[PDB]
Symmetry: C3
């Protein structure tokens, strides 16, 4: 943690803090919720920042950091991010899928595709041959594009099915997802794990901003809506 | 396995044996059970000691043992225990949750909180900076306390819901869980992975006694009850 | 990847290719399927070769290869296969279980037993003490035999239950499974990870042929049948 990771500590520290407080806020928010469906959205959404909190701390303390030889050098790689995403990204997808009461088959596809995206991202992050790192990047990107596709096609129906009553929240949470998520591959490609055009320091800041928005930001919007209570034809505001 | 792990072999061996026989006994016990719900409790409960059997053997053979530098020394750490618990603790929680027909949202919360408890416990077990090991211990402990809380609040209802007919078993299995589980953090804190007040030898014995009671002990009580067959208003003793 | 793995590259390359094309074919095949149940079989079955594709490539590029000291030598071990199987074997079992609408309890048992089979296989593959490698092999084999057993007993009922209408597909997919799966333990035992009677080169070819048949082969048969649409009393050919 001397020359490996240090300048970026500030972002890691802020990251940890913002994720901790977010978890505590959603935790308090969920107290009292007796609604079955509401219970699902709270559990899922609370765990997301909780898990990230854990991994951000591992990176801050230096545990979730490792050196990867490539390009003829020792490159500081935060593998901890993948352990985080492995569980948080599928969970966020569960939030969107549950809103529209997606089919099991669609959930499985979304989850599997995400595991591939993260798993291949991790392999690319640890791959010793530079050129091959981008081969893994391309496959993970295809996995992501598959996911984005599913979220926009064959995932809704207003004819009393998936988006018949209150689907406005889903549309907004979908907008954020596609926008934020699509930024990760770019950051990775230009940062320390990729071309190295942006220093690890700036890379960390970007991932911190993206993570907090995709977890806490995403969470705030979802847990404030009325869509988490009713889908048939009952809002349930209070 | 020379100076790293040796004196504790006896407990590891006994551990392995008691877990093996327990798995074989539950295995035989489940033969014939056609009851759907009963089938769930048998599958879950049989797998628990089966998994532990595997990990206890890995520790006995030396595979699930690693050296962790901290406190200015090479500390023998049985990481295998975490691989065990990662799967067995959520499974035990599934047994309790299924008994009371808990909500999905509650199951998710219980499972997620457990994964955090185990994951953070593992990170603390492998952390190179001594003082930081206890930071991970505190977080894992909070996760555990969260779980214990859930098991005692907003997890029952006699008004024909969660604990309307036969909930006596749940109460007894809950008593054992809170008592045994709460002992793990103490053992860890005073043993080899923590302060080092108790030798690894005695630590292993304690974890062996606790594990067998929380798995086989817990299993015997559950698989003998009638609660595994009926919940509505039918015991189904024979 | 110099003396460790090289001669076997051809099989790894072919493996990668056959798995890629298989995934792409099932992908195209699933386009349009609106049937809920059909959706499950397509998702599961498509992901299988997709995951294997990823791991076959990791082995081809050298990432999923490691050296394991035993027998007084450095033995080239493709650990990547276990990461593949960890997810693909349970998924294939889900296909068979879903066809007959197996009970939850039975699915859990099948899944748990498979995780043990793969996990113990992995430990045996990485174990440093030669003789102990076969102890792990025996346990994994018992796990496999348990699975085969379940697939042939207490897994069907023509009296309007599990195999009342179209169970012919299940019988054929069961025949292939038991035959192909039973070959893996033999190959492992006689190959590089075991006795070393068959060179790693030939071992790889065998696993490649077995994998493609158990994934793509198995997939083609399943995704062409009408059983994936109806079970009650409706084929749904077109
Ligand atoms: C809380 C974190 C979230 C929502 C993270 C999402 C991450 C991604 C969409 C990352 C995807 C990647 C690729 C498509 C290519 C390879 C590198 C990754 C892992 C950055
Ligand atoms: C079969 C094993 C069982 C039921 C094990 C349960 C384990 C725990 C409740 C362990 C919890 C821990 C903490 C709360 C703090 C950090 C260390 C641990 C992992 C021992
Ligand atoms: C796509 C791959 C498939 C269907 C692979 C299946 C693998 C097995 C049935 C492997 C089982 C093994 C044992 C029973 C003993 C130890 C070694 C293994 C892992 C080869
Ligand atoms: C910043 C808080 C750290 C959390 C430690 C334990 C968390 C358990 C979270 C469970 C969340 C869903 C119910
Ligand atoms: C709303 C009922 C839930 C039925 C099970 C859904 C499984 C979702 C998989 C999520 C992946 C977890 C990391
Ligand atoms: C790099 C830009 C930082 C943006 C921070 C935005 C915080 C949003 C607070 C919510 C305000 C609602 C009206
Ligand atoms: C001590 C017995 C070792 C077990 C080896 C294989 C176990 C498979 C267990 C499946 C349990 C739930 C059905
Ligand atoms: C009784 C029906 C079961 C519905 C799914 C429950 C999922 C439980 C998660 C258990 C965690 C496994 C390690
Ligand atoms: C350290 C104390 C050992 C306790 C062993 C107890 C075994 C319990 C057997 C059940 C007896 C039922 C009457
Ligand atoms: C819907 C189930 C499959 C999801 C697959 C995502 C795959 C991304 C890369 C695949 C490589 C193709 C050979
Ligand atoms: C057809 C409804 C599905 C209910 C959940 C089944 C869980 C199957 C576990 C599969 C293991 C995944 C690797
Ligand atoms: C080692 C033998 C190779 C076998 C290849 C068989 C491919 C099967 C193609 C399907 C033909 C259907 C009539
Ligand atoms: C300086 C540490 C602060 C910890 C927060 C305690 C309050 C938790 C409740 C959140 C509303
Ligand atoms: C040496 C390269 C091996 C082939 C890799 C397949 C890559 C597919 C990328 C996504 C279109
Ligand atoms: C309708 C929900 C809005 C999501 C994006 C919010 C960005 C808020 C920033 C305030 C300047
Ligand atoms: C999604 C729009 C694409 C913008 C261009 C990104 C390129 C980044 C690399 C800088 C050389
Ligand atoms: C000395 C090894 C004993 C193995 C046990 C075989 C019997 C299994 C059936 C359990 C009632
Ligand atoms: C240097 C310490 C970093 C802050 C850690 C947060 C710990 C929370 C413990 C549970 C109350
Ligand atoms: C009502 C179930 C009892 C659980 C604790 C049992 C301990 C038994 C020990 C016998 C001396
Ligand atoms: C749950 C009751 C607490 C008893 C005290 C445990 C302290 C153990 C440490 C010994 C110095
Ligand atoms: C030489 C690479 C070929 C890639 C395949 C592109 C077509 C995909 C659609 C499959 C029918
Ligand atoms: C030194 C050997 C330890 C005992 C292992 C139990 C093996 C069971 C194999 C399956 C019948
Ligand atoms: C009834 C399905 C057949 C499964 C085995 C097929 C083998 C085909 C090989 C063609 C020579
Ligand atoms: C399933 C039939 C068994 C055939 C014999 C396999 C033995 C392989 C080892 C070669 C010495
Ligand atoms: C000198 C104190 C370091 C910062 C502590 C802040 C906790 C978020
Ligand atoms: C150390 C700062 C604590 C953050 C509290 C949350 C502000 C809304
Ligand atoms: C159900 C998803 C399986 C996870 C596969 C891992 C991808 C490399
Ligand atoms: C209709 C979608 C436009 C193209 C989106 C992304 C390209 C990879
Ligand atoms: C909700 C409409 C999406 C438009 C996205 C623009 C793509 C660059
Ligand atoms: C409503 C416009 C959608 C914009 C989506 C952004 C494309 C990257
Ligand atoms: C490296 C990224 C390729 C471009 C993808 C789509 C641009 C919006
Ligand atoms: C050189 C500074 C990079 C700017 C990052 C902006 C954070 C929102
Ligand atoms: C000398 C024999 C060692 C002990 C074997 C016992 C198996 C539980
Ligand atoms: C080696 C001892 C075998 C244990 C058998 C179980 C006793 C009830
Ligand atoms: C460090 C915790 C791992 C998260 C597992 C996710 C539980 C569904
Ligand atoms: C009502 C609960 C009493 C306190 C229990 C545990 C303290 C951490
Ligand atoms: C069933 C009542 C629980 C009392 C536990 C005592 C706490 C130290
Ligand atoms: C019925 C009394 C409950 C005791 C619980 C034990 C507290 C650690
Ligand atoms: C190290 C443990 C702190 C005390 C927890 C509750 C005592 C029953
Ligand atoms: C010095 C012996 C420790 C006692 C452990 C007791 C096992 C129940
Ligand atoms: C010289 C070209 C190597 C083989 C490429 C084939 C892709 C399947
Ligand atoms: C490089 C060969 C491509 C394979 C296409 C699939 C043949 C049916
Ligand atoms: C060594 C076996 C791992 C256990 C996985 C649990 C299956 C639900
Ligand atoms: C009725 C089954 C015959 C024996 C099968 C496998 C032996 C391990
Ligand atoms: C479908 C009948 C199975 C016979 C298998 C032969 C075993 C060697
Ligand atoms: C219909 C005959 C079944 C053959 C099964 C093969 C046994 C290994
Ligand atoms: C090494 C394998 C033992 C024999 C198993 C059953 C033969 C069909
Ligand atoms: C020496 C060649 C081994 C034969 C392997 C056959 C592939 C089906
Ligand atoms: C030396 C490799 C043997 C493989 C022969 C042909 C495989 C079909
Ligand atoms: C990022 C801080 C989370 C709390 C928002 C109210
Ligand atoms: C502790 C604050 C409670 C928040 C209620 C909405
Ligand atoms: C579960 C932690 C995995 C670490 C990845 C390098
Ligand atoms: C669970 C471990 C995640 C890290 C991957 C190397
Ligand atoms: C690696 C992630 C596993 C996905 C489980 C649904
Ligand atoms: C690099 C892939 C970007 C995808 C755009 C949505
Ligand atoms: C220094 C400001 C940090 C906030 C990140 C968006
Ligand atoms: C610990 C031994 C398990 C069997 C109890 C009958
Ligand atoms: C092999 C013993 C059978 C047990 C029946 C209860
Ligand atoms: C799956 C085995 C993980 C080992 C942890 C150090
Ligand atoms: C599955 C691996 C568990 C060990 C963690 C280091
Ligand atoms: C690491 C444990 C995963 C939890 C799956 C429900
Ligand atoms: C160290 C935590 C103990 C919890 C008591 C139930
Ligand atoms: C020597 C006795 C071991 C039993 C553990 C409770
Ligand atoms: C092995 C090739 C897969 C495609 C079969 C049509
Ligand atoms: C691209 C080919 C389409 C296949 C339709 C069955
Ligand atoms: C998730 C990858 C694990 C690698 C096993 C050695
Ligand atoms: C997820 C990691 C699989 C490799 C086991 C060592
Ligand atoms: C290691 C495989 C986990 C099984 C999840 C159902
Ligand atoms: C080595 C085990 C073979 C099993 C035969 C079906
Ligand atoms: C060289 C032929 C390869 C096909 C494997 C069955």
């Amino acid at each position: 943690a001397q020359i490996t990771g240090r300048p970026e500590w500030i972002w890691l520290a802020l990251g940890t803090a913002l994720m901790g407080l977010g978890t505590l806020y959603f935790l308090v928010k969920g107290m009292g919720v007796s609604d079955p469906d509401a219970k699902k959205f709270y559990a899922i959404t609370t765990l997301v920042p909780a898990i990230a909190f854990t991994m951000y701390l591992s990176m801050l303390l230096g545990y979730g950091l490792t050196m990867v030889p490539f390009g003829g050098e020792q490159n500081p790689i935060y593998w901890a991010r993948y352990a985080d995403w492995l569980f948080t990204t599928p969970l966020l997808l569960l939030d969107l899928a549950l809103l529209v009461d997606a089919d099991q088959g669609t959930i499985l596809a979304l989850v599997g595709a995400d595991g591939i995206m993260i798993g291949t991202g991790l392999v690319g992050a640890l791959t010793k041959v530079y050129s091959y790192r981008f081969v893994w990047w391309a496959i993970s990107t295809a996995a992501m594009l598959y996911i984005l596709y599913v979220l926009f096609f064959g995932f809704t129906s207003k004819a009393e099915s998936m988006r018949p009553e209150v689907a406005s929240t889903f549309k907004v949470l979908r907008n954020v997802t596609v926008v934020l998520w699509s930024a990760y591959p770019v950051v990775w490609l230009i940062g320390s794990e990729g071309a190295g055009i942006v220093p690890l320091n700036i890379e960390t800041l970007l991932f911190m901003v993206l993570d907090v928005s995709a977890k806490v930001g995403f969470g705030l919007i979802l847990l404030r809506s009325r869509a988490i209570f009713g889908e048939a034809e009952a809002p349930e505001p209070s």
